[PDB]
Amino acid sequence: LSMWYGESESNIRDIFDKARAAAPTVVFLDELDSIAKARGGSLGDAGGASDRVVNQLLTEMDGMNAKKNVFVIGATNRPDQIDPAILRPGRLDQLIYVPLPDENARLSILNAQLRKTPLEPGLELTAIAKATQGFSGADLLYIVQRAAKYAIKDSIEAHRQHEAEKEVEPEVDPVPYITKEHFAEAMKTAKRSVSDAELRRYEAYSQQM
């Protein structure tokens, strides 16, 4: 978007020209609640610029034949504010819902986030998967990062203790793995990400669509 006249549509025009030039490609339109905003026609607006943006995106997305085979990917947080003119079958018809993780998906998230980490051999993640029911991957990453921060603080304390006892020898790191006490201390302030009413709104939208 630009404050000048014509540039706010010329940006979408030459971005889609660069997409049509390097075929095939993938155009990831992130956060479509700012481009494909709902109109709400009540005779009062800022002048009709978002309408021109939506119309330019519609006439630049309708000229997609079997040639040049581009693909447009969208990902929004609020699906209620998306235009039904851009959610029309024939222009953008697919709708994949990404739900909250289950027990096995949560265990897979906890196993994939701990790939390149020196984990303890006597440590299991099934208790973390079972004790947390309405959690998500972002706050699970927050839990793992707080455990890593506690392990780094313990390493710094052991290093300054070793320096004090040397000035007044352990291994290359006194805490070579993330212990269970670090996870038990990191899960003390482990809140959840999403509330309950947002899940009700997403379930209502999934039942409507």
CB 97, min distance to another protein, A: 17
Nearest CB to another protein, comparing residues 5 and 69: 5
Q: Which amino acid, 108?
A: S
Q: Provide, rounded to whole angstroms, the least separation between the CB of residue 66 and another protein.
A: 27
Q: Which amino acid is at 51?
A: D
For residues 12 and 56, the answer to whether their CB atoms sit within 8 Å is: yes
> Which is closer to another protein, CB of 67 or CB of 115?
115
CB 12, min distance to another protein, A: 13
Give the type of residue at 195: S
Closest to another protein by CB, 95 or 141: 141
Q: How far apart are CA 53 and CA 137, in angstroms?
A: 34
Output the smallest distance, CB 53 to another protein, in A.
10
Residue number with CB closer to another protein (88 or 153):
153
Residue type, 191: K
Residues that bind another protein (CB under 8 A): 1-4, 8, 28, 30-31, 33-34, 37, 40, 42, 44-47, 49-50, 77-78, 80-81, 115-118, 123-124, 127, 131-133, 138-139, 141-142, 144-146, 148-149, 151-153, 155-156, 173, 178, 180, 184, 187-195, 198
Q: Is the peptide bond before 121 cis (omega within 30 degrees of 0)?
A: no
Determine the Cα–Cα distance for residues 87 and 52; give it in Å rounded to an integer. 17
Which CB sits closer to another protein, 28 or 97? 28
% helix, strand, coil for the chain, step of 5: 50, 5, 45
Helices (H), 98-195: 103-113, 126-131, 137-167, 180-186
Least Å from the CB of residue 49 to another protein: 6
